[PDB]
Design a protein around this ligand. Structure first.
Ligand code: CHL
Ligand code: CHL
Ligand code: CHL
Ligand code: CHL
Ligand code: CLA
Ligand code: CLA
Ligand code: LMG
Ligand code: LMG
Ligand code: LUT
Ligand code: LUT
Ligand code: LUT
Lengths: 222, 50, 35, 222, 221, 44, 243
């Protein structure tokens, strides 16, 4: 329903006013929300756009990888006490049993955090270096923000109409994922429990077991 | 109906001790799990749906 | 015997899903009439 | 008169030791002391966005400071008209009292007990207000984003614009003092645990020791 | 090297093409790292350059200032009240005050308000003169970033090729200093002990005394 | 107890679900049928 | 805008289309006044001059009864909720300070303050104030004053001003320069005032019937609707059950 152009939906509904001039609806996820003038020149608008989409994809992965192991732990998969809650999952590799995938001894069973970090550093260094320059040994020229090709094996992005609607879906889902990831970060600090645990605690008695029940735990004391 | 059972004389409770009485409803069970477990219940014996 | 219940639940859900989404699959356009 | 604040010979951010004022701060807006040494307002549209943002921040912080000062000032001797709620950073717990929060000691004012209901009403009203501010509504349609002055200036005041400019500068510096005092209130809340008026009285009790240096070792990691 | 389109860059070959057009290598320290586009504008690039250089000098001074008292507590047994850097500011609050090397006749400072007042007045004047770049004839010139005049007494401000090379050396050393100072700030919070003593603890056994050992300190309950 | 039973009679089990695997196969079957229906859209 | 339902020949009437066709509406009600519903069961409208002369009194009654209804319902509610009013009930408010026990004025949100004025002084200044006010109303002359709308207006501002709708000093917030919004706000004012006169009459008759204030009436009615209403208070005391 007109996801681009001048008649795009905006970030305040009918009370949005005049959108900024630099936001013409050329790019996906344009709701006209720039109240601080960050995107005055299009170069930093491009840098902020690629940073936003990279953060969006990383947050989709993060939200899925935060929800899924805890749901599996509550549904039967043996995550003992720290592998379930994501903010203590990093402490799982320091036990004698180590980091086991799905609680299986034969799966992964990692104990060297140094080796894990070194492998992650070199692999992500190669991957982000290939992403940064736009050239890889196996692919020559693509859109540095929307590559496709080897990254699109099923080929859902062929015609511009569905490519644009799927781009809007991607950026909006990533924005929801970033919002939920910030929610996870604040919920872990404030409540000290997992996200699914906070949700189930909210479902028991939402009138009193909400965020306002934890508003008096950060009060300074003289 | 909710206001009638809460603040306007209550409703007749047959489960009140002694044989039932006109009771004022206090602390209605607003928990979604137990409320909708009636809805997703089987309609056979022992469950009876709603 | 839990496996039998899981299998029966899967088959029932499969057939009920075909029914529901087949009737969602624009059933009035399978009209042999005009309109 | 007006040349002290709206010209090349205006007041600066270092006095006589500031000749390198940025060229895009010629001076035609309230304030404009030349303090853009980090250069976040090089783009004129970014500059106007930040100016509008700063004026809104100032107008919020004036009310914020006067609302953080007033109930502590209006506290009586025995403290029966205010419980812990006289201190600004523990006033929210006034909604969780046995009778809710009353505006004063007598219970006939406000007497609200549902934090969720008052929050929902507050969000709805503030959303309508901010939408009218950024778009235009009953109070105005195409007025200035900072100075509408039609339905928001009923007492007249803004005559002879050579003095209205001085009044604008009065507003922006009072708001700057308010934001500075609001930051002071926040940092005092973090480290002392007492209200700002209590901190003022304790500083006047003995200024040789009762200051921030008495709390300089609070966050020492042990 | 460190200048021009063939300059060394912040991702090696991985940054040979995707480099900002405004980062042409004319100014030292240019490795092409502006992936956020914070200095796309030339005036904000100049302001951020000045901010970065002042931060570089300040953190070089700081990194030499919060290490040398602890190394003097090490080695040749120089005694202080508390050689730890993040617990040094409280030494004025002690009965013996603050002394430079423990000698009672060296500093013996007890008035924290007076030392704050003299410091703020003195270097408020100094930073006002730095931002102004002189006032009515007295050093009323120079770029307020590389003054040289009455600031390079030994006369190393000559031979512009090696001057630019030394500028590259300075900005790289300052970037290392700010990275190390951020490391000092983070280690102080997560351990509560001195940096060189953390180094000594790491040298005893690197497989146990590492940052991962204190990674569970800030977990929420 | 001479023999093993599920003991699922009564108790108000949601959709008669006693183990989470049952609800998960309900969700999976409905979701994959919905996914096939959703991918096979814009027809006729 | 949207003046096609409160003005003109096709407008909202006191009876719908089936009840009241437009033919038997009186010929002097052509939808040019605010709040014209064509309501004339009895012959009191006469002609246009008569209906505007009576509209003068209607508007005065409306603007008085709005303040009357608010000043009846507010202090009794405050006294019932816990304010120190001592006389929030409207039909016994005057009798409190008969012998010098002067009332307390409650200027929210910072009220509770004594009024050190006797009844003779209060009624004397009230007469010498509102007699001058009504003399200014029926003559259209004011000496001098300052208003937020027009600043430091002289005596030559009330001449030529519309009767019953004098703009300027009485319109500091304006929002009446546009004639369409002015007309719809006029019909809003006359409808609110008619509701207020009805409410004040209800207050008086309710007080006469039950002996307590309207706030007490509404609170007890929401506490027990079937157990407390007009038929309950007219029963006198309880009722013999029909068992
Ligand atoms: C985005 C990445 C990322 C995040 C958010 C975390 C978060 C966490 N790790 Mg961790 N890790 C991450 C990556 C990695 N970790 C490890 C290896 C470990 C180990 C071995 C351990 C942890 C532990 C912890 C927790 C420490 C408790 C704490 O600080 O609580 C307060 C903080 C929070 C509750 C959440 C804070 C969210 C928000 C403020 C973060 C904002 C962004 C960050 C600045 C991250 C920036 C990343 C950039 C540089 C790429 C914590 C929730 C420890 C643990 O489980 O302790 C119980 C632990 O033992 N991590 C590796 C190597 C494989 C990583 C590689 O990428
Ligand atoms: C004549 C000398 C003169 C000097 C030196 C200054 C200096 C200053 N003026 Mg200023 N002014 C001067 C004259 C004049 N001013 C003004 C009008 C204004 C205005 C209107 C404003 C200023 C402001 C400022 C400040 C701007 C920069 C800043 O924020 O730095 C930051 C300062 C520092 C970093 C100093 C820190 C010192 C340090 C010892 C403090 C303690 C550190 C802690 C121990 C650490 C705490 C954290 C740790 C624990 C993690 C600055 C300190 C601005 C300001 O900030 O106002 C509040 C401002 O808004 N001036 C006028 C009238 C025309 C002047 C006339 O002569
Ligand atoms: C700018 C707005 C704002 C601020 C700063 C606060 C601050 C606070 N509220 Mg709060 N509230 C605010 C708005 C609202 N509150 C409530 C409802 C409540 C309740 C019901 C309660 C609080 C409580 C608290 C306190 C939490 C305990 C504490 O000391 O924490 C540490 C914080 C400080 C010591 C103060 C310094 C804060 C500063 C560092 C942060 C400034 C930036 C902010 C993050 C704001 C960001 C933008 C906003 C829009 C999100 C705290 C001082 C609780 C309380 O008082 O318990 C005794 C409590 O029970 N609030 C509502 C709904 C009506 C609000 C609506 O706008
Ligand atoms: C860049 C400057 C600077 C920094 C980083 C510090 C840091 C510190 N000083 Mg300090 N000071 C500084 C300047 C000055 N101090 C003092 C006078 C004192 C006294 C009298 C005392 C301290 C103390 C402390 C410590 C507070 C306890 C703690 O653990 O806090 C939390 C620590 C951290 C969170 C980590 C370190 C801070 C880091 C995050 C800084 C990041 C940048 C800052 C935001 C800079 C802000 C100010 C700038 C703009 C001027 C702390 C590590 C106290 C102490 O030693 O207690 C044992 C103490 O008693 N300082 C003066 C005046 C002579 C200063 C400058 O003129
Ligand atoms: C970038 C986002 C992100 C991040 C940072 C993490 C991070 C983490 N995840 Mg997670 N996850 C994510 C996204 C993410 N996940 C998403 C999107 C999903 C949904 C699919 C999951 C689902 C998931 C599950 C189910 C589990 C984790 C687990 C973990 C933790 C340990 C991972 C591990 O065991 O090694 C890395 C894992 C792999 C490399 C894949 C596992 C492959 C298994 C062993 C199958 C073996 C393949 C094959 C048969 C054998 C290979 C043969 C070989 C010789 C070629 C770790 C902290 C585990 C945990 O302990 O919970 C905290 C856990 O069980 N994640
Ligand atoms: C299904 C309900 C319903 C609906 C949708 C309508 C709709 C309409 N009626 Mg109508 N009417 C109804 C019920 C309804 N009526 C009933 C029960 C009566 C008997 C009193 C009437 C008697 C009636 C007459 C005599 C006339 C209309 C007329 C009209 C038409 C326009 C004028 C008008 O709105 O009159 C307004 C009606 C009233 C002011 C009556 C008071 C209604 C108030 C608002 C009650 C508040 C509702 C509240 C929830 C209580 C409901 C009780 C509930 C528990 C059952 C309009 C299309 C007129 C017409 O036909 O045009 C030529 C006309 O002359 N109606
Ligand atoms: C268009 C949309 C089409 C289809 C959408 C279908 C499903 C959407 C996702 C549903 C995911 C929740 C159900 C599965 C689940 O995790 O809960 C499964 C649980 C099963 O029930 C619980 O399971 C626990 C173990 O996980 C315990 O062992 C117990 O069996 C019981 O407490 O919830 C239910 O009661 C099933 C009904 C859920 C409604
Ligand atoms: C025709 C006219 C309809 C007239 C009347 C309809 C009557 C009732 C309407 C439904 C009421 C019950 C709704 C919930 C059902 C339920 O939860 O079942 C739950 C029951 C669970 O059944 C038992 O539950 C027990 C615990 O309560 C135990 O766990 C047992 O193991 C389990 O088998 O499942 C069923 O018996 C039937 C559900 C599947 C129905 C398949 C046919 C669907 C056909 C069409 C669907 C179209 C869309
Ligand atoms: C637009 C605008 C305009 C205006 O005007 C201005 C402004 C205001 C500026 C704006 C806004 C902005 C914003 C909102 C921002 C935000 C962001 C975010 C939230 C991000 C996140 C983001 C987030 C993210 C990424 C996240 C991620 C996550 C992750 C990775 C996770 C991971 C994990 C997991 C899985 C699990 C395991 O076990 C562990 C871990 C490892 C932990
Ligand atoms: C200029 C420049 C230039 C260069 O170069 C660079 C730079 C540095 C960037 C710059 C600077 C800047 C600055 C200074 C900033 C700051 C700001 C602030 C402080 C704000 C605040 C601001 C502040 C604010 C708003 C505040 C507000 C407040 C409030 C609301 C409060 C409220 C309240 C009250 C009443 C009471 C109760 O009980 C509680 C509450 C409810 C809570
Ligand atoms: C390039 C780029 C590009 C992209 O795209 C974007 C971005 C991301 C933005 C980027 C990056 C950035 C960065 C890295 C930053 C950082 C910085 C730093 C670290 C600083 C520090 C800095 C640092 C510093 C100054 C420091 C300083 C220090 C000091 C003074 C010290 C002092 C002291 C002493 C001696 C003594 C005593 O007893 C203690 C104390 C008091 C403590």
């Amino acid at each position: 329903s007109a996801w681009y152009g001048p008649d795009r939906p905006l970030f305040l509904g009918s009370l949005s006013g005049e959108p900024p001039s630099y936001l013409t609806g050329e790019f996906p996820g344009d709701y006209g929300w720039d109240t601080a003038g960050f995107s005055a020149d299009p170069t930093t608008f491009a840098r902020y756009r690629t940073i936003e989409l990279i953060h969006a994809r990383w947050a989709l992965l993060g939200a899925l990888g935060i929800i899924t192991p805890e749901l599996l732990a509550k549904n039967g998969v043996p995550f003992s006490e720290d592998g379930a809650i994501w903010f203590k999952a990093g402490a799982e590799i320091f036990k004698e049993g180590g980091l086991n995938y799905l609680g299986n001894e034969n799966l992964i069973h990692a104990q060297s955090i140094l080796a894990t970090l070194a492998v992650q550093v070199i692999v992500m260094g190669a991957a982000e270096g290939f992403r940064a320059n736009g050239e890889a040994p196996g692919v020559e020229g693509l859109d540095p923000l929307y590559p496709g090709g080897p990254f699109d094996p099923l080929g859902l992005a062929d015609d511009p109409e569905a490519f644009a609607e799927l781009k809007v879906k991607e950026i909006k889902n990533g924005r929801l994922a970033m919002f939920s990831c910030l929610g996870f970060f604040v919920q872990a600090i404030v409540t000290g429990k997992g996200p699914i645990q906070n949700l189930q605690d909210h479902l028991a008695d939402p009138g009193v077991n909400n965020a306002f029940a934890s508003a008096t735990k950060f009060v300074p004391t003289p | 109906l909710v206001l009638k059972a809460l603040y306007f004389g209550g409703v007749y409770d047959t489960w009140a001790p002694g044989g039932g009485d006109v009771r004022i409803i206090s602390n209605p069970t607003t928990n979604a799990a137990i409320i909708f477990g009636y809805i997703v219940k089987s309609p056979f014996g022992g469950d009876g749906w709603i | 015997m839990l496996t039998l219940k899981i299998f029966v639940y899967t088959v029932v859900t499969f057939f009920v899903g075909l029914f529901i989404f087949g009737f969602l699959s624009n059933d009035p356009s399978r009209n042999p009439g005009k309109g | 008169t007006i040349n002290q604040f709206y010209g090349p010979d205006r007041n600066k951010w270092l006095g006589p030791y500031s000749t390198n004022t940025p060229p895009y701060l010629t001076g035609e807006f309230p304030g404009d002391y030349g303090w853009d040494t980090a250069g976040l307002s090089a783009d004129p549209e970014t500059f106007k966005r930040y100016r509008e943002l700063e004026l809104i921040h100032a107008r919020w912080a004036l009310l914020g400071a006067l609302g953080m000062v007033t109930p502590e000032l209006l506290q009586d001797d025995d403290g029966i008209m205010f419980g812990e709620s006289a201190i600004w950073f523990k006033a929210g717990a006034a909604i969780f009292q046995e009778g809710g929060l009353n505006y004063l000691g007598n219970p006939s004012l406000i007497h609200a007990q549902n934090i969720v209901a008052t929050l929902a009403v507050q969000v709805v009203l503030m959303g309508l207000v901010e939408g009218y501010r950024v778009n235009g509504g009953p109070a105005g349609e195409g007025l200035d984003p900072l100075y509408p002055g039609e339905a928001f200036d009923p007492l007249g005041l803004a005559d002879d614009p050579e003095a209205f400019a001085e009044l604008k500068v009065k507003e922006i510096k009072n708001g700057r003092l308010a934001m500075f005092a609001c930051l002071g209130f926040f940092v005092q809340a973090i480290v002392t645990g007492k209200g700002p008026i209590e901190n003022l009285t304790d500083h006047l009790a003995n200024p040789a020791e009762n200051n921030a240096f008495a709390y300089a070792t609070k966050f020492t990691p042990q | 090297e460190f200048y021009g389109p063939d300059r060394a860059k912040f991702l090696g070959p991985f940054s040979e093409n995707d480099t900002p057009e405004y980062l042409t290598g004319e100014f030292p320290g240019d490795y092409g790292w502006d992936t956020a586009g914070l200095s796309a504008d030339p005036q904000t690039f100049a302001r951020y350059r000045e901010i970065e250089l002042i931060h570089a000098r300040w953190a070089l001074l700081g990194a030499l200032g919060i290490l040398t008292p602890e190394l003097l507590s090490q080695y040749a047994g120089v005694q202080f009240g508390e050689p730890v850097w993040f617990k040094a500011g409280a030494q004025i609050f002690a009965a013996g005050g603050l002394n430079y090397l423990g000698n009672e006749s060296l500093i013996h400072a007890q008035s924290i308000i007076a030392t704050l007042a003299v410091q703020v007045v003195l270097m408020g004047l100094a930073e006002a003169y730095r931002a102004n770049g002189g006032s009515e004839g007295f050093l009323d010139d120079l770029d307020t970033l590389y003054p040289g005049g009455a600031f390079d007494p030994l006369g190393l401000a000559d031979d512009p090729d090696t001057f630019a090379e030394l500028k590259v050396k300075e900005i790289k050393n300052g970037r290392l200093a700010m990275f190390s100072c951020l490391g000092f700030f983070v280690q102080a919070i997560v351990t509560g002990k001195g940096p060189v003593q953390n180094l000594t603890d790491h040298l005893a056994d690197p497989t146990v005394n590492n940052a991962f050992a204190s990674a569970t300190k800030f977990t929420p309950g | 107890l001479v023999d093993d039973r599920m003991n699922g009679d009564g108790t108000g089990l949601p959709f008669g679900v006693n183990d989470g695997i049952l609800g998960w196969v309900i969700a999976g079957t409905l979701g994959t049928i919905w996914a096939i229906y959703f991918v096979s859209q814009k027809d006729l | 805008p949207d003046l096609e339902k409160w003005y003109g020949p096709d407008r909202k009437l006191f009876l719908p289309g089936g009840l009241l066709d437009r033919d038997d509406v009186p010929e002097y009600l052509n939808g040019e006044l605010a709040g014209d519903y064509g309501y004339d069961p009895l012959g009191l409208g006469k002609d246009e001059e008569q209906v505007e002369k009576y509209r003068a009194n209607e508007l005065l009654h409306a603007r008085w009864a709005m303040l009357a209804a608010a000043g009846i319902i507010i202090p009794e509610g405050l006294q019932a909720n816990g304010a120190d009013i001592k006389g929030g009930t409207w039909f016994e408010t005057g009798a409190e300070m008969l012998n010098g026990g002067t009332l307390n004025y409650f200027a929210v949100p910072f009220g509770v303050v004594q009024n050190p004025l006797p009844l003779a002084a209060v009624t004397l200044i009230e007469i010498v104030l509102l007699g001058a006010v009504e003399k200014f109303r029926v003559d259209g002359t004011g000496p001098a004053g300052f208003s937020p709308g027009v600043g430091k207006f002289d005596s030559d501002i009330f001449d030529g001003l519309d009767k019953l709708y004098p703009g300027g000093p009485f319109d500091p917030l304006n929002l009446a320069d546009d004639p369409e919004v002015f007309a719809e706000l006029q019909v809003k004012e006359i409808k609110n005032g008619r509701l207020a006169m009805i409410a004040v009459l209800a207050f008086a008759i309710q007080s006469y019937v039950t002996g307590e204030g309207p706030y007490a009436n509404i609170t007890k009615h929401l506490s027990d609707p079937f157990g407390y209403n007009l038929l309950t208070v007219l029963q006198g005391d309880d009722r013999v059950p029909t068992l």
